[PDB]
Short mmCIF file of the C-alpha atoms (twelve columns), coordinates in Angstrom:
data_MODEL
# 
_entry.id   MODEL 
# 
loop_
_atom_site.group_PDB 
_atom_site.id 
_atom_site.type_symbol 
_atom_site.label_atom_id 
_atom_site.label_alt_id 
_atom_site.label_comp_id 
_atom_site.label_asym_id 
_atom_site.label_seq_id 
_atom_site.Cartn_x 
_atom_site.Cartn_y 
_atom_site.Cartn_z 
_atom_site.pdbx_PDB_model_num 
ATOM 1   C CA . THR A 1   37.493 -51.125 106.474 1 
ATOM 2   C CA . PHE A 2   37.567 -53.422 102.996 1 
ATOM 3   C CA . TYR A 3   38.652 -56.887 102.720 1 
ATOM 4   C CA . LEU A 4   39.636 -59.179 99.684  1 
ATOM 5   C CA . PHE A 5   36.730 -61.685 98.872  1 
ATOM 6   C CA . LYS A 6   38.296 -63.903 96.438  1 
ATOM 7   C CA . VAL A 7   40.552 -63.382 93.146  1 
ATOM 8   C CA . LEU A 8   39.243 -63.036 89.595  1 
ATOM 9   C CA . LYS A 9   41.621 -63.229 86.844  1 
ATOM 10  C CA . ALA A 10  40.084 -61.284 84.011  1 
ATOM 11  C CA . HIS A 11  42.567 -62.051 81.009  1 
ATOM 12  C CA . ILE A 12  45.901 -63.106 80.390  1 
ATOM 13  C CA . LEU A 13  46.962 -60.603 77.926  1 
ATOM 14  C CA . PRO A 14  47.133 -56.928 79.166  1 
ATOM 15  C CA . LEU A 15  43.954 -55.241 80.525  1 
ATOM 16  C CA . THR A 16  42.989 -51.918 79.272  1 
ATOM 17  C CA . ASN A 17  40.251 -50.369 81.567  1 
ATOM 18  C CA . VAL A 18  38.122 -51.058 84.211  1 
ATOM 19  C CA . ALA A 19  34.367 -49.539 84.806  1 
ATOM 20  C CA . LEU A 20  31.595 -50.199 86.958  1 
ATOM 21  C CA . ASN A 21  27.797 -49.471 86.727  1 
ATOM 22  C CA . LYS A 22  25.872 -47.057 88.876  1 
ATOM 23  C CA . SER A 23  24.571 -49.173 91.620  1 
ATOM 24  C CA . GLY A 24  27.823 -51.103 91.645  1 
ATOM 25  C CA . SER A 25  26.053 -54.276 90.308  1 
ATOM 26  C CA . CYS A 26  27.903 -54.535 86.851  1 
ATOM 27  C CA . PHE A 27  31.704 -53.536 85.904  1 
ATOM 28  C CA . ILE A 28  33.007 -53.888 82.344  1 
ATOM 29  C CA . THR A 29  36.652 -55.128 81.598  1 
ATOM 30  C CA . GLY A 30  38.560 -54.514 78.303  1 
ATOM 31  C CA . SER A 31  41.917 -56.114 77.307  1 
ATOM 32  C CA . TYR A 32  44.447 -56.783 74.686  1 
ATOM 33  C CA . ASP A 33  42.728 -59.996 73.558  1 
ATOM 34  C CA . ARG A 34  40.681 -57.911 71.231  1 
ATOM 35  C CA . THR A 35  37.433 -58.256 73.797  1 
ATOM 36  C CA . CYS A 36  35.474 -56.714 76.185  1 
ATOM 37  C CA . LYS A 37  33.784 -58.884 78.782  1 
ATOM 38  C CA . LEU A 38  30.802 -58.088 80.999  1 
ATOM 39  C CA . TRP A 39  31.159 -58.979 84.750  1 
ATOM 40  C CA . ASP A 40  28.859 -58.521 87.582  1 
ATOM 41  C CA . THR A 41  29.948 -57.649 91.118  1 
ATOM 42  C CA . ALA A 42  27.768 -60.312 93.132  1 
ATOM 43  C CA . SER A 43  28.216 -63.469 91.108  1 
ATOM 44  C CA . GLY A 44  31.420 -62.658 89.356  1 
ATOM 45  C CA . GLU A 45  29.731 -64.496 86.343  1 
ATOM 46  C CA . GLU A 46  31.058 -62.949 82.961  1 
ATOM 47  C CA . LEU A 47  27.646 -62.300 81.885  1 
ATOM 48  C CA . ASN A 48  28.612 -61.481 78.020  1 
ATOM 49  C CA . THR A 49  31.493 -61.274 75.953  1 
ATOM 50  C CA . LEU A 50  31.765 -58.330 73.395  1 
ATOM 51  C CA . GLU A 51  33.634 -59.768 70.227  1 
ATOM 52  C CA . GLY A 52  33.727 -57.877 66.808  1 
ATOM 53  C CA . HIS A 53  36.575 -55.588 67.259  1 
ATOM 54  C CA . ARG A 54  39.693 -56.374 65.111  1 
ATOM 55  C CA . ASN A 55  42.128 -54.810 67.734  1 
ATOM 56  C CA . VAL A 56  42.693 -53.742 71.438  1 
ATOM 57  C CA . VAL A 57  39.656 -52.356 72.983  1 
ATOM 58  C CA . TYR A 58  41.041 -49.668 75.331  1 
ATOM 59  C CA . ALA A 59  38.304 -46.958 76.026  1 
ATOM 60  C CA . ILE A 60  35.111 -48.429 77.578  1 
ATOM 61  C CA . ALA A 61  32.320 -46.927 79.808  1 
ATOM 62  C CA . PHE A 62  28.742 -47.596 80.827  1 
ATOM 63  C CA . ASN A 63  25.723 -45.841 79.964  1 
ATOM 64  C CA . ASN A 64  25.637 -44.407 83.644  1 
ATOM 65  C CA . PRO A 65  23.107 -43.619 85.381  1 
ATOM 66  C CA . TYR A 66  21.091 -45.551 82.911  1 
ATOM 67  C CA . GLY A 67  23.657 -48.348 82.291  1 
ATOM 68  C CA . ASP A 68  21.445 -50.184 79.823  1 
ATOM 69  C CA . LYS A 69  24.010 -49.923 76.705  1 
ATOM 70  C CA . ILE A 70  27.887 -50.135 76.324  1 
ATOM 71  C CA . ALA A 71  30.250 -48.312 74.141  1 
ATOM 72  C CA . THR A 72  33.907 -49.377 73.410  1 
ATOM 73  C CA . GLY A 73  36.543 -47.546 71.714  1 
ATOM 74  C CA . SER A 74  39.629 -49.449 70.212  1 
ATOM 75  C CA . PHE A 75  42.894 -49.068 68.867  1 
ATOM 76  C CA . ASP A 76  41.371 -48.839 65.232  1 
ATOM 77  C CA . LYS A 77  38.996 -46.907 63.154  1 
ATOM 78  C CA . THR A 78  36.198 -48.162 65.397  1 
ATOM 79  C CA . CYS A 79  33.547 -47.259 67.831  1 
ATOM 80  C CA . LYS A 80  31.025 -49.932 68.872  1 
ATOM 81  C CA . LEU A 81  27.999 -49.857 70.669  1 
ATOM 82  C CA . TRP A 82  26.336 -52.516 72.464  1 
ATOM 83  C CA . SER A 83  23.583 -53.291 75.011  1 
ATOM 84  C CA . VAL A 84  24.023 -54.570 78.723  1 
ATOM 85  C CA . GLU A 85  20.880 -56.738 78.184  1 
ATOM 86  C CA . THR A 86  22.143 -58.793 75.010  1 
ATOM 87  C CA . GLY A 87  25.604 -59.136 74.055  1 
ATOM 88  C CA . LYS A 88  25.148 -58.280 70.222  1 
ATOM 89  C CA . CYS A 89  26.798 -55.390 68.115  1 
ATOM 90  C CA . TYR A 90  24.306 -52.348 67.364  1 
ATOM 91  C CA . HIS A 91  25.857 -49.349 65.937  1 
ATOM 92  C CA . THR A 92  28.892 -48.832 63.626  1 
ATOM 93  C CA . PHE A 93  30.956 -45.663 63.839  1 
ATOM 94  C CA . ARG A 94  33.997 -45.488 61.629  1 
ATOM 95  C CA . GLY A 95  35.718 -42.242 60.639  1 
ATOM 96  C CA . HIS A 96  38.665 -41.641 62.959  1 
ATOM 97  C CA . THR A 97  42.138 -41.557 61.480  1 
ATOM 98  C CA . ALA A 98  43.926 -43.216 64.450  1 
ATOM 99  C CA . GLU A 99  43.668 -44.999 67.551  1 
ATOM 100 C CA . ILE A 100 40.516 -44.324 69.507  1 
ATOM 101 C CA . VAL A 101 41.449 -43.803 73.400  1 
ATOM 102 C CA . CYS A 102 39.075 -41.761 75.245  1 
ATOM 103 C CA . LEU A 103 35.292 -41.806 75.139  1 
ATOM 104 C CA . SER A 104 32.488 -40.610 77.234  1 
ATOM 105 C CA . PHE A 105 28.519 -40.260 77.177  1 
ATOM 106 C CA . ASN A 106 26.052 -37.263 77.313  1 
ATOM 107 C CA . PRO A 107 23.260 -36.568 79.562  1 
ATOM 108 C CA . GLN A 108 19.864 -38.207 78.724  1 
ATOM 109 C CA . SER A 109 22.008 -40.902 76.955  1 
ATOM 110 C CA . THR A 110 22.230 -38.587 74.030  1 
ATOM 111 C CA . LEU A 111 24.960 -39.755 71.603  1 
ATOM 112 C CA . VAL A 112 28.633 -40.238 71.690  1 
ATOM 113 C CA . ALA A 113 31.667 -38.075 71.568  1 
ATOM 114 C CA . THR A 114 34.906 -39.967 71.074  1 
ATOM 115 C CA . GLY A 115 38.703 -38.671 71.654  1 
ATOM 116 C CA . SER A 116 41.164 -40.249 69.432  1 
ATOM 117 C CA . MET A 117 44.838 -39.743 68.792  1 
ATOM 118 C CA . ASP A 118 43.998 -38.734 65.063  1 
ATOM 119 C CA . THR A 119 44.239 -35.076 66.903  1 
ATOM 120 C CA . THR A 120 40.481 -34.832 66.532  1 
ATOM 121 C CA . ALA A 121 37.136 -35.539 68.800  1 
ATOM 122 C CA . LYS A 122 34.014 -36.592 66.918  1 
ATOM 123 C CA . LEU A 123 30.486 -36.490 68.061  1 
ATOM 124 C CA . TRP A 124 28.281 -39.470 66.499  1 
ATOM 125 C CA . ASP A 125 24.643 -40.046 66.656  1 
ATOM 126 C CA . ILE A 126 23.149 -43.300 68.172  1 
ATOM 127 C CA . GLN A 127 19.755 -43.439 67.877  1 
ATOM 128 C CA . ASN A 128 20.314 -42.692 64.461  1 
ATOM 129 C CA . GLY A 129 23.992 -43.690 63.727  1 
ATOM 130 C CA . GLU A 130 25.263 -40.603 62.145  1 
ATOM 131 C CA . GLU A 131 28.627 -38.464 63.321  1 
ATOM 132 C CA . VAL A 132 27.035 -35.223 63.389  1 
ATOM 133 C CA . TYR A 133 30.127 -32.968 64.351  1 
ATOM 134 C CA . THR A 134 33.843 -32.987 64.156  1 
ATOM 135 C CA . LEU A 135 35.789 -31.372 67.096  1 
ATOM 136 C CA . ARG A 136 38.964 -29.826 65.431  1 
ATOM 137 C CA . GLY A 137 40.957 -27.684 67.832  1 
ATOM 138 C CA . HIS A 138 43.933 -29.643 68.956  1 
ATOM 139 C CA . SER A 139 47.389 -30.250 67.854  1 
ATOM 140 C CA . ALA A 140 47.986 -33.365 69.885  1 
ATOM 141 C CA . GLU A 141 46.360 -36.543 71.165  1 
ATOM 142 C CA . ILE A 142 43.008 -36.173 73.257  1 
ATOM 143 C CA . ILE A 143 43.505 -38.511 76.203  1 
ATOM 144 C CA . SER A 144 40.820 -37.166 78.940  1 
ATOM 145 C CA . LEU A 145 36.909 -37.013 79.177  1 
ATOM 146 C CA . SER A 146 34.381 -34.992 80.707  1 
ATOM 147 C CA . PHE A 147 30.625 -33.883 80.405  1 
ATOM 148 C CA . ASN A 148 28.921 -31.034 82.102  1 
ATOM 149 C CA . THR A 149 25.917 -31.568 83.753  1 
ATOM 150 C CA . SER A 150 23.304 -30.758 81.075  1 
ATOM 151 C CA . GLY A 151 25.511 -31.540 78.295  1 
ATOM 152 C CA . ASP A 152 26.041 -28.048 76.776  1 
ATOM 153 C CA . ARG A 153 29.770 -28.321 76.848  1 
ATOM 154 C CA . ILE A 154 32.327 -31.005 76.557  1 
ATOM 155 C CA . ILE A 155 36.246 -30.126 77.657  1 
ATOM 156 C CA . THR A 156 38.967 -31.944 75.685  1 
ATOM 157 C CA . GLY A 157 42.230 -32.140 77.349  1 
ATOM 158 C CA . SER A 158 45.260 -33.038 75.548  1 
ATOM 159 C CA . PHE A 159 49.204 -33.529 75.156  1 
ATOM 160 C CA . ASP A 160 49.525 -30.085 73.534  1 
ATOM 161 C CA . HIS A 161 49.271 -28.550 77.143  1 
ATOM 162 C CA . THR A 162 45.971 -27.310 76.100  1 
ATOM 163 C CA . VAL A 163 42.265 -27.869 77.400  1 
ATOM 164 C CA . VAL A 164 39.590 -26.875 74.716  1 
ATOM 165 C CA . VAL A 165 36.372 -26.399 75.885  1 
ATOM 166 C CA . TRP A 166 33.627 -27.184 73.246  1 
ATOM 167 C CA . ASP A 167 29.970 -26.455 73.051  1 
ATOM 168 C CA . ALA A 168 27.902 -29.751 72.144  1 
ATOM 169 C CA . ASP A 169 25.505 -27.434 70.838  1 
ATOM 170 C CA . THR A 170 27.510 -25.510 67.829  1 
ATOM 171 C CA . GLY A 171 30.389 -27.889 67.958  1 
ATOM 172 C CA . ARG A 172 32.656 -25.025 68.048  1 
ATOM 173 C CA . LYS A 173 35.067 -24.004 70.692  1 
ATOM 174 C CA . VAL A 174 34.048 -21.979 73.564  1 
ATOM 175 C CA . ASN A 175 37.360 -21.179 75.116  1 
ATOM 176 C CA . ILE A 176 40.916 -22.849 75.167  1 
ATOM 177 C CA . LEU A 177 42.662 -23.181 78.633  1 
ATOM 178 C CA . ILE A 178 46.109 -22.287 78.447  1 
ATOM 179 C CA . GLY A 179 48.894 -22.132 80.914  1 
ATOM 180 C CA . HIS A 180 50.016 -25.677 81.540  1 
ATOM 181 C CA . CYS A 181 53.793 -26.379 80.638  1 
ATOM 182 C CA . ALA A 182 53.662 -30.018 80.132  1 
ATOM 183 C CA . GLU A 183 50.947 -32.865 78.925  1 
ATOM 184 C CA . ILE A 184 47.788 -32.732 80.595  1 
ATOM 185 C CA . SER A 185 46.474 -35.975 82.536  1 
ATOM 186 C CA . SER A 186 42.861 -35.319 83.688  1 
ATOM 187 C CA . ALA A 187 40.154 -32.716 83.788  1 
ATOM 188 C CA . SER A 188 36.656 -32.768 84.748  1 
ATOM 189 C CA . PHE A 189 33.801 -30.533 85.990  1 
ATOM 190 C CA . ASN A 190 32.671 -29.800 89.721  1 
ATOM 191 C CA . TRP A 191 29.244 -29.825 91.132  1 
ATOM 192 C CA . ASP A 192 28.447 -26.500 89.938  1 
ATOM 193 C CA . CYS A 193 30.413 -27.133 86.582  1 
ATOM 194 C CA . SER A 194 31.560 -23.364 86.964  1 
ATOM 195 C CA . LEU A 195 35.255 -24.682 87.705  1 
ATOM 196 C CA . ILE A 196 37.614 -26.969 85.701  1 
ATOM 197 C CA . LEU A 197 40.264 -28.678 87.565  1 
ATOM 198 C CA . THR A 198 43.181 -29.592 85.440  1 
ATOM 199 C CA . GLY A 199 46.258 -31.393 85.936  1 
ATOM 200 C CA . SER A 200 49.489 -31.966 84.039  1 
ATOM 201 C CA . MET A 201 53.196 -33.327 83.626  1 
ATOM 202 C CA . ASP A 202 54.545 -29.927 84.660  1 
ATOM 203 C CA . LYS A 203 54.226 -30.290 88.269  1 
ATOM 204 C CA . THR A 204 51.090 -28.066 88.578  1 
ATOM 205 C CA . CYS A 205 47.300 -28.337 88.921  1 
ATOM 206 C CA . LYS A 206 45.385 -25.510 87.421  1 
ATOM 207 C CA . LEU A 207 41.990 -24.321 88.187  1 
ATOM 208 C CA . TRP A 208 39.845 -22.546 85.437  1 
ATOM 209 C CA . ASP A 209 36.408 -20.771 85.579  1 
ATOM 210 C CA . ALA A 210 34.052 -22.526 83.268  1 
ATOM 211 C CA . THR A 211 32.231 -19.331 82.360  1 
ATOM 212 C CA . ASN A 212 35.042 -17.323 80.664  1 
ATOM 213 C CA . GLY A 213 38.098 -19.850 80.707  1 
ATOM 214 C CA . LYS A 214 40.026 -17.675 83.091  1 
ATOM 215 C CA . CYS A 215 42.618 -19.556 85.293  1 
ATOM 216 C CA . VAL A 216 41.467 -18.907 88.714  1 
ATOM 217 C CA . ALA A 217 43.883 -20.746 90.634  1 
ATOM 218 C CA . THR A 218 47.541 -22.509 90.096  1 
ATOM 219 C CA . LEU A 219 48.414 -25.264 92.770  1 
ATOM 220 C CA . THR A 220 51.845 -25.912 94.005  1 
ATOM 221 C CA . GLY A 221 53.495 -28.858 95.957  1 
ATOM 222 C CA . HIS A 222 54.302 -31.858 93.673  1 
ATOM 223 C CA . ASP A 223 57.765 -32.512 92.576  1 
ATOM 224 C CA . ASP A 224 57.326 -34.297 89.401  1 
ATOM 225 C CA . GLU A 225 54.370 -35.442 86.902  1 
ATOM 226 C CA . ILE A 226 50.964 -35.224 87.788  1 
ATOM 227 C CA . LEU A 227 49.012 -38.488 86.610  1 
ATOM 228 C CA . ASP A 228 45.339 -37.665 88.033  1 
ATOM 229 C CA . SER A 229 43.294 -34.883 89.743  1 
ATOM 230 C CA . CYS A 230 39.621 -35.018 90.883  1 
ATOM 231 C CA . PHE A 231 36.926 -33.004 92.847  1 
ATOM 232 C CA . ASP A 232 34.703 -35.212 95.054  1 
ATOM 233 C CA . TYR A 233 31.016 -35.556 94.834  1 
ATOM 234 C CA . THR A 234 30.513 -32.272 96.904  1 
ATOM 235 C CA . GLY A 235 33.203 -30.101 95.025  1 
ATOM 236 C CA . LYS A 236 34.234 -28.560 98.262  1 
ATOM 237 C CA . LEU A 237 37.489 -30.229 98.200  1 
ATOM 238 C CA . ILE A 238 40.396 -31.244 95.513  1 
ATOM 239 C CA . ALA A 239 42.484 -34.285 95.173  1 
ATOM 240 C CA . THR A 240 45.735 -34.632 93.040  1 
ATOM 241 C CA . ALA A 241 47.756 -37.751 92.271  1 
ATOM 242 C CA . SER A 242 51.167 -37.373 90.885  1 
ATOM 243 C CA . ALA A 243 54.152 -39.290 89.821  1 
ATOM 244 C CA . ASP A 244 56.088 -37.424 92.609  1 
ATOM 245 C CA . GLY A 245 54.627 -40.480 94.324  1 
ATOM 246 C CA . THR A 246 52.505 -38.256 96.666  1 
ATOM 247 C CA . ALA A 247 49.142 -37.344 96.890  1 
ATOM 248 C CA . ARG A 248 47.785 -33.774 97.825  1 
ATOM 249 C CA . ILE A 249 44.678 -32.446 99.183  1 
ATOM 250 C CA . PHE A 250 43.474 -28.884 98.446  1 
ATOM 251 C CA . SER A 251 40.441 -26.489 99.197  1 
ATOM 252 C CA . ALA A 252 37.973 -25.570 96.508  1 
ATOM 253 C CA . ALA A 253 37.524 -21.945 97.854  1 
ATOM 254 C CA . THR A 254 40.648 -21.622 99.793  1 
ATOM 255 C CA . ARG A 255 43.143 -23.268 97.704  1 
ATOM 256 C CA . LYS A 256 45.442 -23.600 100.306 1 
ATOM 257 C CA . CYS A 257 46.851 -27.286 100.552 1 
ATOM 258 C CA . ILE A 258 44.815 -28.905 103.437 1 
ATOM 259 C CA . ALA A 259 46.795 -32.235 103.631 1 
ATOM 260 C CA . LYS A 260 49.496 -34.648 102.284 1 
ATOM 261 C CA . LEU A 261 49.114 -38.308 101.777 1 
ATOM 262 C CA . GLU A 262 52.375 -40.374 102.228 1 
ATOM 263 C CA . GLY A 263 53.385 -43.942 102.705 1 
ATOM 264 C CA . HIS A 264 54.044 -44.613 99.077  1 
ATOM 265 C CA . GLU A 265 56.871 -46.736 97.692  1 
ATOM 266 C CA . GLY A 266 56.009 -45.828 94.125  1 
ATOM 267 C CA . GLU A 267 54.168 -43.867 91.283  1 
ATOM 268 C CA . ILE A 268 50.600 -42.962 92.222  1 
ATOM 269 C CA . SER A 269 48.324 -43.416 89.173  1 
ATOM 270 C CA . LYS A 270 44.616 -42.853 90.323  1 
ATOM 271 C CA . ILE A 271 42.616 -40.950 92.463  1 
ATOM 272 C CA . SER A 272 39.107 -40.891 93.616  1 
ATOM 273 C CA . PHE A 273 36.486 -39.739 96.512  1 
ATOM 274 C CA . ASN A 274 33.842 -41.904 97.910  1 
ATOM 275 C CA . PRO A 275 30.248 -40.588 97.358  1 
ATOM 276 C CA . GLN A 276 30.043 -39.459 100.632 1 
ATOM 277 C CA . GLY A 277 33.435 -37.532 100.775 1 
ATOM 278 C CA . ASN A 278 35.032 -38.658 103.876 1 
ATOM 279 C CA . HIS A 279 37.758 -41.146 102.693 1 
ATOM 280 C CA . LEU A 280 39.770 -41.334 99.427  1 
ATOM 281 C CA . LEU A 281 41.180 -44.110 97.481  1 
ATOM 282 C CA . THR A 282 44.578 -44.635 95.616  1 
ATOM 283 C CA . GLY A 283 45.692 -46.933 93.117  1 
ATOM 284 C CA . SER A 284 49.624 -46.926 92.654  1 
ATOM 285 C CA . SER A 285 52.463 -48.846 90.830  1 
ATOM 286 C CA . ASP A 286 54.163 -50.188 94.080  1 
ATOM 287 C CA . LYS A 287 52.142 -52.806 96.032  1 
ATOM 288 C CA . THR A 288 49.039 -50.976 96.649  1 
ATOM 289 C CA . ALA A 289 45.546 -49.959 96.674  1 
ATOM 290 C CA . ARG A 290 45.285 -47.407 99.617  1 
ATOM 291 C CA . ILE A 291 42.454 -45.596 101.460 1 
ATOM 292 C CA . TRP A 292 43.052 -42.425 103.053 1 
ATOM 293 C CA . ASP A 293 40.897 -39.867 105.227 1 
ATOM 294 C CA . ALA A 294 40.358 -36.474 103.323 1 
ATOM 295 C CA . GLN A 295 40.955 -34.567 106.498 1 
ATOM 296 C CA . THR A 296 43.453 -36.489 108.435 1 
ATOM 297 C CA . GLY A 297 46.088 -37.418 105.858 1 
ATOM 298 C CA . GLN A 298 46.470 -41.061 107.614 1 
ATOM 299 C CA . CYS A 299 46.147 -44.234 105.722 1 
ATOM 300 C CA . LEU A 300 43.003 -45.879 106.833 1 
ATOM 301 C CA . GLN A 301 44.020 -49.188 105.286 1 
ATOM 302 C CA . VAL A 302 46.443 -50.634 102.969 1 
ATOM 303 C CA . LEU A 303 44.721 -53.650 101.138 1 
ATOM 304 C CA . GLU A 304 46.820 -56.089 99.119  1 
ATOM 305 C CA . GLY A 305 46.596 -58.773 96.855  1 
ATOM 306 C CA . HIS A 306 47.652 -57.676 93.458  1 
ATOM 307 C CA . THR A 307 51.064 -58.704 91.935  1 
ATOM 308 C CA . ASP A 308 51.957 -55.753 90.261  1 
ATOM 309 C CA . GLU A 309 50.854 -51.726 89.469  1 
ATOM 310 C CA . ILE A 310 47.325 -50.901 89.864  1 
ATOM 311 C CA . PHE A 311 46.073 -48.589 87.076  1 
ATOM 312 C CA . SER A 312 42.444 -48.403 88.267  1 
ATOM 313 C CA . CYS A 313 40.610 -48.131 91.321  1 
ATOM 314 C CA . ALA A 314 36.974 -46.960 91.999  1 
ATOM 315 C CA . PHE A 315 33.971 -46.884 94.151  1 
ATOM 316 C CA . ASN A 316 30.479 -47.894 93.584  1 
ATOM 317 C CA . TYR A 317 28.209 -44.922 93.779  1 
ATOM 318 C CA . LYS A 318 27.255 -45.416 97.403  1 
ATOM 319 C CA . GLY A 319 30.678 -46.718 98.453  1 
ATOM 320 C CA . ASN A 320 29.406 -50.234 98.938  1 
ATOM 321 C CA . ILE A 321 32.143 -51.758 96.890  1 
ATOM 322 C CA . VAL A 322 35.648 -50.979 95.431  1 
ATOM 323 C CA . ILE A 323 36.842 -52.146 92.191  1 
ATOM 324 C CA . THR A 324 40.749 -52.388 91.028  1 
ATOM 325 C CA . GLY A 325 42.126 -53.043 87.624  1 
ATOM 326 C CA . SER A 326 46.065 -54.061 87.909  1 
ATOM 327 C CA . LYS A 327 48.810 -54.762 85.552  1 
ATOM 328 C CA . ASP A 328 48.597 -58.433 86.168  1 
ATOM 329 C CA . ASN A 329 45.219 -58.719 84.160  1 
ATOM 330 C CA . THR A 330 43.363 -59.408 87.224  1 
ATOM 331 C CA . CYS A 331 40.108 -57.217 88.530  1 
ATOM 332 C CA . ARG A 332 39.515 -57.303 92.329  1 
ATOM 333 C CA . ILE A 333 36.413 -56.236 94.264  1 
ATOM 334 C CA . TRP A 334 36.489 -55.242 97.909  1 
ATOM 335 C CA . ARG A 335 33.543 -55.203 100.281 1 
# 
């Protein structure tokens, strides 16, 4: 069971993304106010404010597990890198020829890979400051992010109905996953990193082999667009969020649908498992952030407080706390 603590209104102009640190201590918030602000979960104090960008900061993440540095991607040429210790601007990355919307880091806190709407992805060096490689293999916007454990590969999802699997080693395409009939929402690796789970706007979720890049499974059930898809910490199960307004739970190995999650008055935006793998969290357009059991299908709790749609919802890494970003430019914590 979860409850509201109090309310924290992050900004008054539109909020882009919410992301927490590994132990749950910290969560970052970006917005249309050209800024990224640094909040901690316990105090609620805005630790630092990250100013310097000339536009809306959209894609932000933590250096998790390490969580000692911050990168921010914005609606310009820019990617900036900060530390969490001090709020100053460290590294400069310019070169993308369109809005930068998707970024993620590498194992060992290597360097940074940025997915931008310039139809390209780029790898930039950080201890040094170089862009080292340009990943050109898409005909459309890159919107999704993933790194495999060990960081040998990077999968780039795009609006051209294709996933391209790059190798961080060479910087060339390993294989190109083809089969989706509409824009791809999300994609990430499982525990083994042998299988890739993709979702798309063509009512389908597809399950690919990481080895050769062959499509092992095609999952049916949703009646409209798919907005998100996820494995859990174990990789045994599969969760899919859709614009059908329903949430579906499959098997990794059997792929027969195990359960349907219903009770929604709206678009389902986000999906995520707890670190334990026993309940499941949903943020949606209607009134809600809701919590389900992965095996029942029953809604264990509906917890409210936001005044409009919820685009973000995530556990911390031991399921201690839950954080949600909404369209009312407010982030709420649930203990």
